[PDB]
Structures are given as structure tokens and as C-alpha cells.
Design a protein around this ligand. Sequence first.
Ligand SMILES: Cn1ccc([C@H]2C[C@H](N(c3cc(F)c(NC(=O)c4ccnn(-c5ccc(F)cn5)c4=O)cc3F)c3nccn4nccc34)C2)n1
Length: 285
Amino acid sequence: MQNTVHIDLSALNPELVQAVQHVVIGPSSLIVHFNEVIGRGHFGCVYHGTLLDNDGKKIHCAVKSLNRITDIGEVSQFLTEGIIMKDFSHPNVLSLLGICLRSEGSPLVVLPYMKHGDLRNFIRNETHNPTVKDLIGFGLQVAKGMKYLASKKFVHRDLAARNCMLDEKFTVKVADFGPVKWMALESLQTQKFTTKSDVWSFGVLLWELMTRGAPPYPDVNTFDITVYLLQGRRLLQPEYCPDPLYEVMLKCWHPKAEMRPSFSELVSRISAIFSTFIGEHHHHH
Ligand SMILES: Cn1ccc([C@H]2C[C@H](N(c3cc(F)c(NC(=O)c4ccnn(-c5ccc(F)cn5)c4=O)cc3F)c3nccn4nccc34)C2)n1
């Protein structure tokens, strides 16, 4: 039976199994709402979950599972993915709550629940219609999360609005659901990624925010993005986007990687722009 698979934890890489052992969740503290699916694919599924804290109070979570398991390699990759987040501790970066290892079945990767889902779908929703200032604030939040990750020498490689999520307090968490329109020029040419190519992707993400989730380069199938960028062309300034914020976008797309601002510089510059735009806003950024 597929629900009787038993994983030999001693087959896993020693550093991986040490990391998993520090984040174990006892099954008695977790209710997986197997009938409440957040998202499903061929290989995995994410469910609503309830964690019971040490007072018996409820923590809403999301619980990742593998579907059918046939080899230890699938399990190792699944756990390695979860453990990426283990040492992330920042308000603007998605964290790992832990890993639940029942006797049988898939290991379960437990994450804090993000009430408002991914940032791109959130800002595209016509009944959310976020204000200019709140969109700037979301960008500032992403910049703060990326400043933290860059300080840990973590290169994201797929920063985009679709990979950020928004929780109940409207805190943005940089994440990766697991991308040529977001890639730096040098990454398109060499397939090498750095923090400076994350800065390029952040520029595109800011553009996504200020267009309320318009697809960048919508005609991409009709031209070559490398040629476009080599000839100096860039995404055009969104309507209602403040001029200094568009200049920030342009700096992120400098053809010379070393000339792009650091994420520390971006936090300072966007915080200045946020502070002087006096408009309606709702969220704590
Ligand atoms: C076809 N389909 C569409 C959707 C899905 C499922 C649901 C979706 N889902 C989700 C998002 C993630 F983003 C993750 N993330 C990771 O598993 C992860 C692994 C390793 N490293 N990072 C990371 C973190 C920070 C960083 F800088 C770089 N990487 C990760 O984020 C897991 C999820 F289940 C959630 N949907 C709604 C609400 N919530 N609430 C918590 C999680 C989610 C996925 N399927």
C-alpha cells in the first residue's frame, strides 16, 4: 500500500539528517487537514494544517507532502528543500516551522500559513486594487528580506512577485514555490546567478508591483529579450509610478552587475521614497 511506505532516515546525508532532527514536529502536535488542499501537483500536495502550540493554542500552517514515494532520492530532495529555510529568521523571509515524520507515509514539511497567498495574484485582484503607497511598501518589504538573504550569502535565483507571499498582517515573505523575463543580462548569457542578478530581478519585481501585476514584456514570444537588453531597452515606467522609484528600477537593470545598488542601498532609497509619498495606505511595511 502506498500509505505504508517507510523511510530509512539513516540513508540520508548526515548534515541533512542532523538538520531535520533539530526541527522535528511530533505527530500529536499536528493536524493535517488532508481534505483542505491549498495546491496540488503531480509530485506533491500542500494542505491546510493546524499546529498545537505548547499551550494547546492553534497555529495555522501549510503542510507539504509528497504524493507517491518510490525512492529515497525523492525524499532527500524534498527534505533538502524544506531545510533551505531552517536558518532563515527574518520577518520578510519565509521560515520553516518544522518537519513531521510519521511512521508511515510522506514526511511533512510545515510552514507558516500565508493568508493572502502569493503577492502577484494578491495585487492583481480587482477587489484588492492596492494603493500606490501600499505597493511601494510591499517593495520595501521585499528589499528588506533580500537584504537579509544577501547578508547570509543566499542567492535566490528566481525572485519575482509570484514567489513572494503575504500573511494575515500584510507582511511580505520572500519565498520560492519551486525565468528569462526576470533574469539579468549576464545570467541570460552565461547562466550564472549572483546577488547582483537578484538585484536585477528585484527591479522587475518592483515593476510588477507598480503595474499591479502586469506581465513584464508581454510580447516576449515575438522578440529576443537578450537582444532587447543588449540594445539598452528596458521596461517602461508604469503609470502613477513616482519618477525616483522608476530611477531605482533602472539602476537595478544596469548592464554592469557591480554598478547595481546593493539591497542595503535599495532599502534606504525605497524607504525614503515611501516616506515622502503621502497617499492612502493600509499595511505596516
Ligand atoms: C500548483 N500549486 C500552486 C501552489 C501550490 C502550493 C501552495 C503553495 N504554497 C507554498 C508556497 C511556497 F513559497 C512554499 N515554499 C517552499 O516550500 C520553499 C522551499 C525551500 N526554500 N524556500 C525559500 C524561502 C525563502 C527564500 F528566500 C527562498 N526560498 C521556499 O519558499 C511552499 C508552499 F507550500 C502556499 N500557498 C498558499 C499559502 N501558503 N502559505 C504557506 C505556503 C503557501 C505551493 N501548488
